[PDB]
Write a protein that binds this ligand. Structure first.
Ligand SMILES: [K+]
Ligand SMILES: [K+]
Ligand SMILES: [K+]
Ligand SMILES: [K+]
Ligand SMILES: [K+]
Ligand SMILES: [K+]
Ligand SMILES: [K+]
Ligand SMILES: [Mg+2]
Ligand SMILES: [Mg+2]
Ligand SMILES: [Mg+2]
Ligand SMILES: [Mg+2]
Ligand SMILES: [Mg+2]
Ligand SMILES: [Mg+2]
Ligand SMILES: [Mg+2]
Ligand SMILES: [Mg+2]
Ligand SMILES: [Mg+2]
Ligand SMILES: [Mg+2]
Ligand SMILES: [Mg+2]
Ligand SMILES: [Mg+2]
Ligand SMILES: [Mg+2]
Ligand SMILES: [Mg+2]
Ligand SMILES: [Mg+2]
Ligand SMILES: [Mg+2]
Ligand SMILES: [Mg+2]
Ligand SMILES: [Mg+2]
Ligand SMILES: [Mg+2]
Ligand SMILES: [Mg+2]
Ligand SMILES: [Mg+2]
Ligand SMILES: [Mg+2]
Ligand SMILES: [Mg+2]
Ligand SMILES: [Mg+2]
Ligand SMILES: [Mg+2]
Ligand SMILES: [Mg+2]
Ligand SMILES: [Mg+2]
Ligand SMILES: [Mg+2]
Ligand SMILES: [Mg+2]
Ligand SMILES: [Mg+2]
Ligand SMILES: [Mg+2]
Ligand SMILES: [Mg+2]
Ligand SMILES: [Mg+2]
Ligand SMILES: [Mg+2]
Ligand SMILES: [Mg+2]
Ligand SMILES: [Mg+2]
Ligand SMILES: [Mg+2]
Ligand SMILES: [Mg+2]
Ligand SMILES: [Mg+2]
Ligand SMILES: [Mg+2]
Ligand SMILES: [Mg+2]
Ligand SMILES: [Mg+2]
Ligand SMILES: [Mg+2]
Ligand SMILES: [Mg+2]
Ligand SMILES: [Mg+2]
Ligand SMILES: [Mg+2]
Ligand SMILES: [Zn+2]
Lengths: 219, 115, 110, 305, 154
RNA sequence: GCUACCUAAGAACAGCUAAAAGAGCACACCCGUCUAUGUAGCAAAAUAGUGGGAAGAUUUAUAGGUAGAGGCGACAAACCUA
RNA sequence: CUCGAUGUUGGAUCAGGACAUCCCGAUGGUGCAGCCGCUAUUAAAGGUUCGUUUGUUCAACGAUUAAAGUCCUACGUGAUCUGAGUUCAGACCGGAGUAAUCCAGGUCGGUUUCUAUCUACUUUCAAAUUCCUCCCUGUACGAAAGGACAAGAGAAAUAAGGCCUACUUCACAAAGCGCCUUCCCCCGUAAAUGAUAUCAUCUCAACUUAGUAUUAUACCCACACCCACCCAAGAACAGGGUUUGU
């Protein structure tokens, strides 16, 4: 059972009624536009209505590098390289302008965010805009792509070697010396993962959401 | 996104914008009252020691949703009347520039790719 | 910066004796029913807490004697017994701490 | 002489009983006001030009995005009406002002934390006490009998309203955050002067002018946002979707009133007057009322053609 | 602007805060009743409740053992957590510890609190007790409660 | 007994490069460029970082010498018990 | 007046005021056709750019702008900051002097202390300014060239006040680079009717109109639960919640 990340609210003091009504609007949109299951690293093609484009319809293909936001405003970022130029578009899931979301290739990566692909080689961000979709067998585990990219020479957009980022899909051996790896460890926080009070347990929250989702499908 | 002293990349095939030079093209003025340039805003470039107006067709700064974001700051050299200096634009440009066909009709006429 | 002039006692008395700087009378003081000594409503009684701590200190000393060194924490429950008492059915299999005194009235056996 | 609270002397058995007793009474009192038109309502006059009706008190749930039929994105703030009743009506002569006043409360709270004078005020009215009470200036023909419940259907989509609430208090703040001063540079020699106000006056006057921008308490004051369009009305949960943001944190009580801007004057002809009565309505309103330009969630995708 | 900040600022920093709570938590597990400043006890109380939850996961759970390894600086208390404290609260879903305020510390007049695990072998704390049901106020309310139940049945 | 210079007889200078060095990198050590802090301060001249030198005209312990109309000084009118 | 001390340029910061108005508003005259200007009356609510060189105030120059106003405030403000300049002790060059030494000559370097006693002040107003585009319109005007105003529509910038749905710095939240809202008037003159003076005359004649707001409205508004706990409230105090007091 896959629950979309936007349905799970962030920790806060917001009244649960606000989330419940906001979820109702999301569900009524999902029965008009089908939102398929995807993760960060999947290849998606999104068709949207652009008032100025030729044919009033625009299609963009790219790799989902980040999913963030909650509620109707949830967004995902698709990155691709077109004619040697890196282009990123931050689509909105529940925007009525979106006509169709197609999962060309459903897969997961070693990291929850692929923002470092900007500093990686252009080959890891270049995908064919006319690639045929990959058939996914039913009742099968989502494939995890353990590919590790090669980074461009420093400086980078962000200090990806820092422990707080917790990046596992970068060939740090090929681009960073041992001294730089040791220097980056000065920011490590071993106590952070053992801080029990900072844990966010959403197992009971997700249970209630699924009951709401199942109830909506019946009616 | 693009302001004074900002280095830009010319994406048209004009000789001025592609000739090698010891200084990269640099924005010296933005024709906006707030001094911050966005897509569709004209700026003045000090390129090859000369002052040439350019049209911003992409920048690294995030903008509104459903709009493309580029990894480089892209401009197209244009004349004072708005006629582009170059003849072909291979680099894709946002489709949002088509709302300005009244003044950028010739700039969009040489654009091969829209993203 | 330095004072321009000396502040008089009349000015100083107004500042020092202002009701904001005066001690406020407390109204949450009550008599502890168990011992009769004073206590605050939201604070445990000092006399009774000392009484519990005195007995707790004696018990912990007896615990250390049985353990006989550091890192000797048992993997079973502990039961405190006094003179004239024997382990019960529910106390079987638990570490027994013996105190050489009569069981206090306020320390109810469980 | 010692202070006391409601459950200081209650036993273990009594505390659940008292909580159940008062809670049941509050629900019964609220349920008794559900039919204002069957309890001798005051005369209902038709709307006239220059007439001002009463507003509501709503709780700020949060913010949510919506999209219009032209593709534009508008973010709106959800204001939920929670136990909103008219408390007191004062005549024009007794108001000491130019218009009659109508007192409105909301967000029923515990009786154990209210003053005796307030508790006996609500005892006569027969309602549980309200957290916040606001005073609305109305005309004579817009008078409403005290105790009449108020619902979010009092407003309709397309209407412009004003929202007033206490802003988020930021405590004691310096001039850089409170007043947006530029401050001093970070390097080139600055000695313990980076966020300081600088000069506060001129040397001739020898004093600081009253009303000079100085560090102090920031926020935690009443502010009003004018011209907030109403896009959506949820009659089931009594929620008002007002355009943009409103002052104050989430879960705070706000004051919603018809807009006072000149452009929106005399736009209450089609709005309910003096308020909305669900009991007397011939046909029950739909669950959600949408503005003509709002893309409903069940509507098909936007197509430009 | 400390709006929504739930963690206190204690010690020499973030890491020092964890170590200070860990020493209090380690002392709490060994003695099952410790006394400390009220703020530190209140900050540590949340961690004590969640430590028992990890104990209920069992010693065979690698994640639970790792969490118990970090927070128990004395390794003899790790068997105690999974074999004494965790089985003790098998039938409880919460409320593993009780925190009470004791008189201020003699030296610096600091606000002091006592925290213990419920069900310990130590003598009971002087817990505050509500007024007896036989008091004048409670008798009147009991009579009122009886009247309502009788009327409800009728 | 500080400091300037001198006398007698002592001590210290890792590692690397070059292996020749008033040579380079760089600890100990010596000095005090720049910035911040400090300004009744920890300090009647300091702390933190960054720096110059670090086998030499080096640094340094001990005892001795030169005394005010003077000493001493790789001259800063320096230094000769704040 | 002050040498038993009233601290100097320029900059930063914050600006208070004057109007002899640079821009925006309203008018008179023109060698004012229109578009641009010149000049005068009235108007200080609002605004009055970013940079290269120079310690600079200036000035020159680049790119803009509706405009890049003139002055006062101990040449506003160093118990807020800067120290480039200037102005001690070092040194150099030119020149004056037998030398010491000197030179509104240049040049390099050169310690910016103060824990606030008093006065004053620490949420005033909650009405907004301006540009541009479209349209009017290739119309009025004009031989042609050229080329409006008023009305209307739309989109921005700045300022003020808020907010976190998304983006972004971030993650129980605070923030902007993000989003939302923002409402009256300005008196100079131009015209009637009609006396002194039976025409005429806009009148410190009686009078009429453009022509005016008691600036409209909005905001605020009840009060010992209160020992204690919590808080989107807060330095303390206060304030909100506890029907969320094992
Ligand atoms: K010292
Ligand atoms: K000697
Ligand atoms: K003097
Ligand atoms: K002005
Ligand atoms: K300069
Ligand atoms: K005085
Ligand atoms: K006359
Ligand atoms: Mg960056
Ligand atoms: Mg040149
Ligand atoms: Mg606050
Ligand atoms: Mg700054
Ligand atoms: Mg200095
Ligand atoms: Mg200093
Ligand atoms: Mg500093
Ligand atoms: Mg004076
Ligand atoms: Mg806090
Ligand atoms: Mg501390
Ligand atoms: Mg010798
Ligand atoms: Mg060596
Ligand atoms: Mg050497
Ligand atoms: Mg030495
Ligand atoms: Mg030396
Ligand atoms: Mg060296
Ligand atoms: Mg002698
Ligand atoms: Mg020497
Ligand atoms: Mg000399
Ligand atoms: Mg000299
Ligand atoms: Mg004097
Ligand atoms: Mg200045
Ligand atoms: Mg000013
Ligand atoms: Mg004038
Ligand atoms: Mg004047
Ligand atoms: Mg103006
Ligand atoms: Mg004219
Ligand atoms: Mg001055
Ligand atoms: Mg001064
Ligand atoms: Mg100065
Ligand atoms: Mg100087
Ligand atoms: Mg000379
Ligand atoms: Mg001279
Ligand atoms: Mg120097
Ligand atoms: Mg100099
Ligand atoms: Mg000084
Ligand atoms: Mg100073
Ligand atoms: Mg001060
Ligand atoms: Mg005050
Ligand atoms: Mg026009
Ligand atoms: Mg702001
Ligand atoms: Mg006449
Ligand atoms: Mg006549
Ligand atoms: Mg006439
Ligand atoms: Mg005439
Ligand atoms: Mg009280
Ligand atoms: Zn007692």
């Amino acid at each position: 059972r896959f629950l979309s990340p936007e349905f799970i609210p962030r920790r806060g003091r917001t009244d649960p009624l606000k989330f419940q009504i906001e979820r109702k609007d999301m569900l009524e949109r999902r029965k008009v536009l089908h939102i398929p299951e995807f993760y960060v690293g999947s290849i998606l093609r999104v068709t949207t209505a652009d008032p100025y484009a030729s044919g009033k319809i625009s299609q963009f293909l790219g790799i989902c590098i980040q999913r963030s936001g909650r509620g109707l405003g949830a967004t995902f970022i698709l990155r691709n390289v077109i004619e040697g130029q890196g282009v990123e578009i931050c689509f909105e899931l529940y925007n009525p302008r979106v006509q169709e979301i197609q999962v060309v290739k459903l897969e997961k990566r070693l990291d929850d965010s692929l923002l470092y692909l900007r500093d990686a080689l252009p080959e890891y961000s270049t995908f064919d805009v006319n690639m045929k979709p990959v058939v996914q067998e039913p009742n099968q585990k989502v494939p995890v792509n353990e590919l590790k990219v090669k980074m461009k020479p420093k400086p980078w957009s962000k200090r990806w070697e820092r422990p707080n980022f917790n990046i596992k899909g970068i060939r740090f051996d090929l681009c960073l010396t041992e001294q730089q790896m040791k220097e980056a460890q000065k920011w490590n926080q071993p106590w952070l993962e053992f801080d029990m009070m900072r844990e966010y347990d959403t197992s009971k929250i997700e249970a209630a959401i699924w009951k709401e989702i199942e109830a909506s499908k019946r009616s | 996104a693009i302001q004074k002293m900002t280095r830009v990349r010319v994406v048209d095939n004009s000789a001025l914008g592609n000739s090698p030079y010891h200084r990269a093209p640099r924005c010296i003025h933005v024709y906006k009252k707030n001094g911050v340039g966005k897509v569709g805003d004209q700026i003045l470039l000090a390129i090859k020691g000369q002052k040439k107006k350019a049209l911003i067709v992409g920048h690294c700064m995030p903008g509104p949703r459903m709009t493309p974001r580029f990894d480089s700051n892209n401009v197209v050299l244009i004349e004072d009347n708005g006629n582009p200096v170059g003849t072909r634009i291979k680099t894709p440009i946002p489709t949002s520039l088509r709302k300005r066909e009244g003044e950028y009709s010739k700039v969009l006429a040489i654009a091969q790719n829209f993203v | 910066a330095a004072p321009k002039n000396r502040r008089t006692i009349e000015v100083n008395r107004c500042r020092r004796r202002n009701p904001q700087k005066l001690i406020k009378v407390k109204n949450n003081i009550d008599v502890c029913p168990e011992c009769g000594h004073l206590k605050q409503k939201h604070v445990l009684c000092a006399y009774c807490y000392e009484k519990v701590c005195k007995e707790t200190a004696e018990i912990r000393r007896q615990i250390g004697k049985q353990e006989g060194g550091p890192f000797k924490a048992p993997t079973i429950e502990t039961v405190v017994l006094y003179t004239g008492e024997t382990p019960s059915e529910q106390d079987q299999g638990k570490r027994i701490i013996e105190r050489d005194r009569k069981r206090p009235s306020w320390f109810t056996q469980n | 002489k010692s202070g006391t609270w409601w459950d200081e002397h209650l036993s273990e058995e009594n505390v659940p009983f008292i909580k159940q007793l008062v809670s049941d009474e509050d629900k019964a009192q609220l349920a008794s006001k559900l039919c204002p038109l069957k309890d001798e309502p005051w005369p209902i006059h038709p709307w006239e030009p220059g007439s001002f009706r009463v507003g509501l008190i709503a709780l700020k749930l949060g913010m949510m995005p919506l999209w219009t039929k032209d593709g534009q994105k508008h973010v709106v703030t959800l204001l939920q009406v929670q136990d909103c009743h008219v408390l007191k009506y004062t005549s024009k002569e007794n108001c000491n002002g130019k218009m009659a006043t109508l007192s409105v409360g909301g967000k029923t709270v515990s009786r154990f934390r209210k003053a005796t004078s307030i508790l006996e005020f609500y005892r006569e009215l027969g309602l549980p006490p309200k957290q916040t009470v606001k005073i609305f200036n109305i005309t004579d023909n817009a008078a409403i009998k005290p105790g009449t419940p108020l619902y979010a259907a009092h407003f309709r989509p397309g209407q412009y309203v004003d929202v007033t609430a206490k802003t988020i208090g930021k405590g004691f703040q310096g001039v850089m955050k409170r007043w947006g001063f530029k401050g001093q540079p970070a390097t080139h020699g600055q000695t313990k002067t980076h966020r300081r106000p600088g000069a506060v006056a001129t040397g001739d006057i020898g004093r600081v002018w009253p009303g000079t921008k100085m560090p102090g308490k920031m926020g935690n004051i009443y502010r009003t946002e004018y011209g907030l369009k109403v896009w959506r009305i949820n009659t089931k949960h009594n929620i008002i979707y007002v355009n943009g943001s409103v002052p104050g944190h989430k879960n705070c009580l706000v004051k919603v009133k018809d807009s006072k801007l000149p452009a929106y004057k005399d736009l209450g002809k089609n709005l309910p007057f003096p308020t909305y009565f669900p009991d007397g309505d011939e046909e029950e309103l739909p669950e959600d009322l949408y503005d003509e330009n709002v893309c409903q969630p069940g509507a098909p995708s936007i197509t430009f053609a | 602007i400390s709006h929504g900040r739930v963690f206190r600022r204690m010690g020499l920093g973030p890491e020092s805060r964890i170590h200070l709570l860990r020493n209090l938590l380690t002392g709490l597990v060994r003695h099952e009743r410790i006394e400390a400043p009220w703020a530190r006890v209140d900050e540590m109380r949340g961690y004590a409740e969640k430590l028992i939850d990890y104990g209920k996961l069992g010693d065979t759970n690698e994640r639970a053992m790792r969490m118990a390894d970090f927070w128990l600086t004395e390794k003899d208390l790790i068997p105690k957590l999974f074999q004494v404290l965790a089985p003790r609260y098998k039938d409880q879903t919460g409320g593993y510890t009780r925190m009470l305020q004791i008189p201020n510390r003699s030296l610096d007049r600091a606000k002091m609190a006592v925290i213990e695990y419920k069900g310990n072998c130590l003598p009971p704390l002087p817990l505050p007790r509500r007024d007896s049901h036989l008091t004048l106020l409670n008798q009147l309310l009991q009579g009122l409660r009886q009247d309502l139940r009788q009327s409800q049945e009728a």
